[PDB]
Point group: D3
């Protein structure tokens, strides 16, 4: 039997957003979201850690080739999200509140489509150094 | 079914302490604890990461409102622990050795009383950048 | 029943290496490993986090004594790995590709021999701030 | 703290149903469900194991008073399900195919409604001695 | 490495007991325990499944030699428990209510005493075919 | 998303074998295997529970079409194993001791070959009503 390990790669992207549910009154929104509801928005340098799991290849010594993982992350996170306004430049958030929880879910779905079956293990998103969301496909 | 995610918030506090079990001889104490047994104490800037888990709300997009989580952490960690001497200013450590393991347990119990049933998932305490304790209620 | 917690200690070491499987052609190697295949090698300041788990002792307040853990890590990581060339100075990598996955496995085995039965929980190795491998004995 | 254990109670109920999807043509239903699509139905003596988890109470030695668990199951399982025709007698299955999987889900939901938050651990349904479904709220 | 599997052995024993707490008045005991509080006791043919886990030995193909497992269970279960009156014949239950939960705990403890560190995985006790308790050392 | 559940199907097969290691002397084999080493063999009516896990399909209400699961098991279990002498009739056991543990492993492997990636969850093999092995791919 081959050994199994978890391989993680961290990436960063800068983006803008405003927390606001159109399904709530301007009064409720301001109450639920407060400062994050700033009409003109605000932004963050997000840090994303993507974890893959599998067998360590017996000849190559890798769970997955870093170049492949890099490329998957470029297409699934960097391309659609870097230097964008989440609520305005990405179709997905047209109906979904751009909380870090939903950013983590979005990234998970993107990667699921690109990655081999069962490779994805966890997506961790730091909206700030103190605000972190971990999504494991639950 | 709603999706479930883990929401973490990091906080910091400075405190003082001395590791010493009155249930041991001054000779044993010095042997078990060594430098941490310094009679006049020493101190640390502790970093605490508190993780909550639950469903991502369908309208709000949050596992829990950050303001509520912030407030819970203020009452359960900051208030009793920040700028205090653990063994002298907090009743709990009058009988318990103030190791990081017990600091993690203390914080867990405090939060359990304040948080909704089943929300708390993990308490991580960095006594130093190199010394970490994770308590999951086990 | 005693409470159980996870105790982690982080250590660092600098080492050199080159990724190259003798079981592949010079052409394949360069293709699989690319830059990491540099004939004269390259190097990293590796960060290793070792996690132990067990009961918090009722009198001492510790899952494990830090001095013992420190010493185990000195013998199992620092001694054989610090300021060494992985592929040339450590027997283990004479047949194994020195990927971070195999470095994590090596460290795990070393520690398993030194530690009490069932204490070891996880070995996390940062080859870089962005490249991390977690091995849990799977 | 207090030790935690799992308490299971087995219950059995008699019911009939017909596997049929209104989104599939008469021909697809036969092909997908075969004999289970028999127009007039068929039936089973379903066996259901409900597992609860919690701390063993220090004075009574119980995770849950069996009398309470029995009442819970009379309500969540026996009353709506026993000696009924699933597809016609229980509104839930009006728009849901009555597979063993959906019976398990239905039961899980009825139980979460009555039981203390966090108590329910698993629902196991034996449609026959050979076909079993386990639902754990995933 | 070597594959890991779980080995279970089922054993059965006959015993009597009475559910009664000396911390509850005669009236509370009746109310809490009902028929199980019958002054002269009642009994069960208890069925116990003991699960061990470990690596499949490469030469013998065994996780544990069944002969060793049988002896372990004769000692931990059959000798102290078979054909006994729980509350009167086993000192452990002198101060502990003999619920199925406590029988499982007792058995788990007796086994941890004899078995190799880390081997014991689960203890399942059927008091009746309908009342089951699973203890996993939590 | 879609709910996830586990589907199990039980199958039974008749077979004979002899526990014997060619790496052990005639005397060690008797000592290690006892009665199971009987030169002419012995046999069992093996019972096998195969557990699959996945999402409950939104239209059919199935985790897997039972017809597909039956065919899978006819192929992976019944055909190579039923009414056979394990050590002599199945090449796999030519060099592997036919313990229940190895039967479980063998079955797990045959199933992983046929089943969709990620579907197989557990293999449980009852050699007798008292000796059970569970393999989960570890
Ligand atoms: Zn924001
Ligand atoms: Zn200190
Ligand atoms: Zn490198
Ligand atoms: Zn049916
Ligand atoms: Zn009883
Ligand atoms: Zn046999």
């Amino acid at each position: 039997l081959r050994r199994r390990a978890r391989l993680s790669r961290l990436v960063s992207f800068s983006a803008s957003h405003r927390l606001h549910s159109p399904s709530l009154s301007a009064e409720e929104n301001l109450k639920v979201f407060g400062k994050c509801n700033n009409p003109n928005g605000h932004g963050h340098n997000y840090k994303v850690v993507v974890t893959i799991h599998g067998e360590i290849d017996p000849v190559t010594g890798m769970v997955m080739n870093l170049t492949d993982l890099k490329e998957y992350m470029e297409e699934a996170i960097m391309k659609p999200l870097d230097h964008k306004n989440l609520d305005l430049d990405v179709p997905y958030f047209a109906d979904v509140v751009s909380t870090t929880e939903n950013v983590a879910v979005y990234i998970w779905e993107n990667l699921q489509r690109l990655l081999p079956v069962g490779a994805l293990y966890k997506v961790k998103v730091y909206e700030t150094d103190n605000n972190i969301v971990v999504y494991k496909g639950e």
